[PDB]
Subunit: 266 residues, 3 copies
Amino acid sequence: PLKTLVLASVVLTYVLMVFGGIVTSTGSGLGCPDWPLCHGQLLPFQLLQPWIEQTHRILGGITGIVLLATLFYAFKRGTSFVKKALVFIFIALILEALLGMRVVITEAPLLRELLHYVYTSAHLILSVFILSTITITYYYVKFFGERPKEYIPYADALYVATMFQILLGIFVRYVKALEYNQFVYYLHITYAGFLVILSLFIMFKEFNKYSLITFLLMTAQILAGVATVISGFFLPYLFLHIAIGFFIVLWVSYLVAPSVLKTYTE
Amino acid sequence: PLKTLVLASVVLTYVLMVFGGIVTSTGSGLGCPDWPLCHGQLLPFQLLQPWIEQTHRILGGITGIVLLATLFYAFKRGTSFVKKALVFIFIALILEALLGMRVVITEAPLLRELLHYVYTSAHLILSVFILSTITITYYYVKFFGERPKEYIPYADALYVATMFQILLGIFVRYVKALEYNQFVYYLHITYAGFLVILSLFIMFKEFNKYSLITFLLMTAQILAGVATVISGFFLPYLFLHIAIGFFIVLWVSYLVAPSVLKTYTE
Amino acid sequence: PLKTLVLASVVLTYVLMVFGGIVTSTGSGLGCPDWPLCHGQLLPFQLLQPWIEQTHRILGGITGIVLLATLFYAFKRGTSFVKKALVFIFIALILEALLGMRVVITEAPLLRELLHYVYTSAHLILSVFILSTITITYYYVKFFGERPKEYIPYADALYVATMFQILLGIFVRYVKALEYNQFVYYLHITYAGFLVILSLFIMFKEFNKYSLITFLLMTAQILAGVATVISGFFLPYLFLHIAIGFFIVLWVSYLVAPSVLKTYTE
Ligand SMILES: CCCCCCCC/C=C\CCCCCCCC(=O)O[C@@H](COC(=O)CCCCCCCCCCCCCCC)COP(=O)([O-])OCC[N+](C)(C)C
Ligand SMILES: CCCCCCCC/C=C\CCCCCCCC(=O)O[C@@H](COC(=O)CCCCCCCCCCCCCCC)COP(=O)([O-])OCC[N+](C)(C)C
Ligand SMILES: CCCCCCCC/C=C\CCCCCCCC(=O)O[C@@H](COC(=O)CCCCCCCCCCCCCCC)COP(=O)([O-])OCC[N+](C)(C)C
Ligand SMILES: CCCCCCCC/C=C\CCCCCCCC(=O)O[C@@H](COC(=O)CCCCCCCCCCCCCCC)COP(=O)([O-])OCC[N+](C)(C)C
Ligand SMILES: CCCCCCCC/C=C\CCCCCCCC(=O)O[C@@H](COC(=O)CCCCCCCCCCCCCCC)COP(=O)([O-])OCC[N+](C)(C)C
Ligand SMILES: CCCCCCCC/C=C\CCCCCCCC(=O)O[C@@H](COC(=O)CCCCCCCCCCCCCCC)COP(=O)([O-])OCC[N+](C)(C)C
Ligand SMILES: CCCCCCCC/C=C\CCCCCCCC(=O)O[C@@H](COC(=O)CCCCCCCCCCCCCCC)COP(=O)([O-])OCC[N+](C)(C)C
Ligand SMILES: CCCCCCCC/C=C\CCCCCCCC(=O)O[C@@H](COC(=O)CCCCCCCCCCCCCCC)COP(=O)([O-])OCC[N+](C)(C)C
Ligand SMILES: CCCCCCCC/C=C\CCCCCCCC(=O)O[C@@H](COC(=O)CCCCCCCCCCCCCCC)COP(=O)([O-])OCC[N+](C)(C)C
Ligand code: HEM
Ligand code: HEM
Ligand code: HEM
């Protein structure tokens, strides 16, 4: 029962994060006649269906329900790892809720804008942390008595590099400091090359289906990212990029889980 | 016979790549009286002997001949690794040939300039991939029955970091997006420090002749890079930098080969 | 007796480096009435108590004395590792002394300014190298007959990444090339995120007091760095940042020492 709950929570979390990145994609009012076929906002240095909103609310509610059910079942017939993982997920959720409470610290326009950037980026950072933790937990509930066979030669370094790239993408999306947004965009597009090189070396070190899928995911995300940039900010291209990025988060978490858990017991 | 062919192909590939980087160095017409003693083009943000051409053509022809001979001898009395390596080298060569065919995709000036940058950078990226693959193959044909003793403590991480630095250098050389060229130049000069730190730590972890040579190669390349920049773009300084960079590519490929091949059979 | 000398040299070196970064912090004349409560110089792109000086001189003299005593006792009843470490510390000290001798190479204003940046940055780089080497030596003199148990899962990668971040901070502090200073400042603040991610993954891989302390040190340094930037350059915030950064240097050196020394004898 716990395995089904954690798998459902992984799915719901991924779908909710992708959905939020699809409504929030230059959709504060989802303007233009082409709901999903109208260019989004360009990067600063380069310068309304009630259905989507109600289904976003429903998705948030249902994923909260399952996360609560998973938390309750973690302490019932669950190991210490699952309890700790859940606790870290719900601490992140509480942090997101507190970030929602935007009690005014200072009305200073500069520090106001910065704090707005901090809140917006921290929401996505906590979402990515929740997704990674729940994916590692989902791996943990499986293979519990099994011997944790590995999947790729360098999951750890790949995990860290991928998470840094995800952080760069979040900064590009939300940190609109203009000089820093341009810098972080150019660091993002360039570090994509490091990710490609690392995936190629991983595939060379041990070629299996997982290495090939990792390289193909990198290449599909890079291609998608470029496309999004090749022509304005087409919503469909911007979406596919978001979906592939969050699935890459999930994929690297799942690939890193066996390397870390191989040193555990049972 | 195969070992001699792969060694000759390694030499020819390195010499051809260096030569191309010596003619292409601000030598579209090789202007100025000092054929090799006249400053080259500065970076965008900072703003004709028939012999060389005919010997470049001869070198390209002879290296193509050997690569073809090596490909033919790979399938004759060769292992699967050598066949795959050759196939990946000739796929890269076919990709370079297709990049030579610059059928007009779009006349859009922006997307035209970008695609020009993509073609120019991809040629060098494929050249570096070919050099690395042929160096790993040359290591493979040697020590075939021998036990693959290691040379440096961290060849893999060193290989990945060095390849990322080479990619940065290629982007600086060819990607003239001005804002991005300045960014990538400053990322190149700064990541050189990371390479120096990594080489120093490698030398500390296990000091032998290979670690010392790696550190000295980094230091000679950094010094050369600075010199090239200290005074305009003197061709001799620009050349030595190119030669040392491509030899660093070869060196890190040769150093990484034993770490990856230690997990193979025979 | 050697262990006491190396521990004293570690302390003196850390305190002298921190002190120098506290006087040199926009204190060429230590102007403004608030000796330690007056904003320092902003970054270029963003635009006198005799006691402190005499105690800085006294601290330099006493730390030189101990370093000399440690060097003398290294060759007396000391192993080869300690002799080599001392020799590398005193070579760095001789290099610092030579950098003090600023014989005029070229009066070219550009190359003069660059060379000034090179001297100022190289002084701090040599100081950090001395601190790291003396911390590794202090670890070596302890546990000499003991089995070198590890402290954190990834000390090496953490050491290299931390040293690169320290290099970035030194460049931000001293390299005032304006376009490059802005770039390196934005690379510093962004690579702090990579350091946080790496520390989090380290803590996940093996949670103990050392992993928690490493993560807390990163987080305290990041917080301090931001504060320094949140409001001008308050001297107290600027100081705490310097002190935490140099202690992070010492901490990562101490954490990396057991991983490298585990492959040694005795
Ligand atoms: C967990 C793993 C990831 C960790 C990532 C840590 C990363 C830490 C990164 C460093 C953060 C601090 C950066 C420096 C602050 C001062 C910036 C200032 O100098 O402006 C600079 C820009 O720089 C800014 O644009 C950067 C903004 C980054 C926001 C990061 C949010 C992190 C949320 C963390 C959530 C943690 C989890 C949730 C909480 C538990 C200068 O540019 P400007 O302002 O444009 O200057 C002109 C302005 N003017 C035109 C108006 C005149
Ligand atoms: C700026 C510069 C940036 C770039 C710098 C360079 C960056 C890249 C640097 C790292 C790569 C360098 C590789 C050099 C040696 C290659 C040899 C290899 O091909 O043979 C090996 C193939 O197993 C894998 O190595 C094959 C995948 C290698 C990548 C090939 C291209 C990617 C597409 C791939 C997919 C499309 C393929 C389409 C064609 C079929 C031999 O293995 P095996 O003996 O057959 O099997 C036993 C070994 N095993 C037990 C572990 C499995
Ligand atoms: C943009 C998105 C791109 C997505 C790309 C996806 C690429 C995915 C590529 C494939 C990745 C998965 C490959 C799994 C292979 C496992 C093999 C091995 O581990 O055997 C294991 C099986 O494990 C399987 O049963 C797990 C199957 C999981 C399917 C996941 C589908 C993901 C869809 C993603 C959709 C994303 C959403 C898309 C729309 C938004 C072990 O099995 P066993 O040994 O038999 O154990 C029995 C032991 N016993 C007998 C004791 C009981
Ligand atoms: C294999 C290992 C290495 C992999 C590396 C992968 C790296 C992928 C990297 C990302 C590539 C895509 C980058 C973003 C595209 C849009 C850029 C646009 O925003 O312009 C931006 C610049 O940015 C550009 O200057 C960057 C150009 C990089 C070219 C890289 C070629 C890669 C070849 C791959 C070959 C693969 C092998 C061969 C094929 C199999 C903005 O700047 P601007 O344009 O100046 O704006 C003003 C313009 N104006 C003044 C005119 C108004
Ligand atoms: C922003 C800051 C950036 C910088 C941050 C720091 C970056 C650097 C951080 C990593 C280095 C930190 C080292 C600290 C400890 C040094 C101890 C070492 O010297 O002794 C060791 C020497 O073996 C090697 O360690 C010697 C090479 C070390 C580098 C010396 C400087 C480079 C020049 C070197 C060449 C010129 C030498 C010229 C003088 C002769 C002791 O080894 P052993 O016991 O004698 O032998 C047995 C061990 N063995 C079996 C493995 C072989
Ligand atoms: C800018 C360029 C800078 C270049 C810097 C170069 C620095 C180079 C520094 C030296 C690097 C090479 C050191 C090799 C040491 C090997 C030791 C060990 O492995 O023994 C091996 C020998 O292996 C040797 O035979 C290989 C010799 C290769 C020489 C390469 C010269 C490179 C020149 C580059 C010119 C570049 C072009 C320059 C002009 C453009 C094994 O031997 P064995 O054990 O006897 O095996 C017998 C087994 N059996 C008995 C069963 C049969
Ligand atoms: C050991 C581990 C760490 C190693 C780190 C190695 C790092 C090597 C890094 C590369 C160093 C060389 C950089 C390029 C040189 C040319 C720069 C030039 O293009 O200016 C560029 C800026 O770029 C500069 O601002 C960068 C300055 C970096 C100083 C680094 C000191 C290293 C000390 C090492 C001590 C070693 C130990 C002590 C000695 C044994 C362009 O910007 P600009 O100039 O502003 O242009 C306009 C100027 N104008 C407005 C006037 C018109
Ligand atoms: C752009 C995006 C950037 C971010 C991307 C993600 C970046 C981060 C990615 C890496 C972290 C991902 C972790 C996922 C799984 C977590 C499971 C873990 O909690 O349980 C484990 C706890 O042991 C440690 O793992 C606990 C520390 C984990 C970090 C928790 C937050 C940091 C605060 C922590 C301190 C405050 C805690 C406050 C609350 C108490 C279970 O271990 P155990 O079974 O109990 O013990 C046996 C195992 N042992 C023998 C090895 C010890
Ligand atoms: C901004 C600064 C932030 C500082 C944050 C500091 C955080 C520090 C957090 C704590 C870090 C230290 C934890 C050590 C735990 C060791 C446990 C284990 O190794 O046992 C070892 C003990 O080792 C101890 O005796 C060493 C004690 C060192 C104390 C260092 C204090 C640092 C203060 C920093 C002040 C900085 C300056 C601040 C002001 C400028 C082994 O012992 P044993 O097994 O009994 O061996 C006996 C064997 N026999 C019996 C055969 C003889
Ligand atoms: C290689 C060329 C790439 C380009 C041109 C590119 C482009 C972009 C752009 C323009 C954004 C801003 C999105 C917005 O403003 O709405 C973005 C965000 C992002 N990028 Fe990239 N990208 C590239 C590579 C990558 C890679 C390789 C990854 C991951 C492995 C990645 C992950 C992300 C993520 C996670 C985001 C944030 C999505 C969100 O916040 O919902 N990108 N990218
Ligand atoms: C440390 C200071 C460095 C400086 C100042 C520097 C400078 C430069 C410059 C200006 C270019 C552009 C060449 C051109 O336009 O023709 C370049 C290219 C390049 N650099 Fe650096 N560099 C440095 C370090 C390094 C290091 C450490 C490496 C490799 C380990 C490296 C590898 C390369 C490569 C491969 C190229 C491309 C050569 C080619 O395309 O033929 N550089 N460098
Ligand atoms: C995360 C946000 C950070 C910000 C906003 C920040 C800010 C700064 C600034 C403005 C300086 C210039 C100091 C000066 O001009 O006097 C500096 C220097 C420095 N930073 Fe950071 N920093 C951050 C993170 C870090 C981290 C994570 C580390 C190390 C792990 C670090 C280490 C250093 C060091 C060593 C210096 C040089 C101190 C000296 O030269 O005495 N910083 N930082």
